[PDB]
Amino acid sequence: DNVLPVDSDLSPNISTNTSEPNQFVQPAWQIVLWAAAYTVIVVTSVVGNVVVMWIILAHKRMRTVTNYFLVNLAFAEASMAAFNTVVNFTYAVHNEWYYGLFYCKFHNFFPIAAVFASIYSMTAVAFDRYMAIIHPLQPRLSATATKVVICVIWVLALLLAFPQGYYSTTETMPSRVVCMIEWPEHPNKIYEKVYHICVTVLIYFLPLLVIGYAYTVVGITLWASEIPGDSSDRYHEQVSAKRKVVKMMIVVVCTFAICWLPFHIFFLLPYINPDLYLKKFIQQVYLAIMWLAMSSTMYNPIIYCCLNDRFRLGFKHAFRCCPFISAGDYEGLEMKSTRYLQTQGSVYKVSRLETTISTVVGA
């Protein structure tokens, strides 16, 4: 059933993804279809993620530790839109890996790093949520640490992403020109088999479990129920506000799992039964999921807008060059003081709370 590519070479038709078009694998139009999907994605992913990164940096008020983690996520998405999607697009219209083996490596490595980093960052977010809920004590926490933490996630991400570059597994996806870890063969010199189990479980699965677990602990504490006003089942507006953040974080995770999980499952199943067909082992299946994972890059900016008024209002401030932020503003801390932005609403040295300075702000 299999050749180096997913299709059988009953005919001599099969040709290397590096050398020629893969038109035999799927209809040519399907190639343009995937190319089309990528092109549109590039626009959305770039604009949305840039907006997120831009807005939080631009608006002084949105400086939360969580915001730091989100920039990290946004950054990971940006790399996808700039780095990975572009190559994936070129290939698609070419119908194969014009770039050749070196590039397959470059292209797989960066995209792999992006996926690993995302799930790992989501875990940090989960843990931080747990910490915020149980121990509101603000001082046990530092912005500086967050940067350190973010860097750490990247380091671990490299731990999986980089070793394939080290003599380890390698390869292109079903129709593909997307490159990923070598699930198909057990290229012995390469020691593929070991790498495969290790990577999925350690990088994707374990972090998924932790996020799930941390999620459960949060269940006892702040839950979905949150009354819009501070009053009612909320003990302080800040407490009531936080519940909003947690819910978005939950949705962010959910969307993440839905997008990626199918790929990871297919990752493993072919590992167990390579050279065979799953329900059907084909170009189409592997392809659909990996490209689907790419869509994730776009979803987070949408969730933010829908999910939180603060970003929504603050973003709008950014969109219209001037303030022009009608629509009711944040009606809370657009900024703590009032409106928030680089300028405009976010007044220098935003106000402080408590005789002492409760939040590390107004420093």
Partner: peptide, 11 residues
């Protein structure tokens, strides 16, 4: 029993 990758086969 997938066929082995051929270096020469690659163009």
């Amino acid at each position: 029993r997938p066929k082995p990758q051929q270096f020469f086969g690659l163009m």
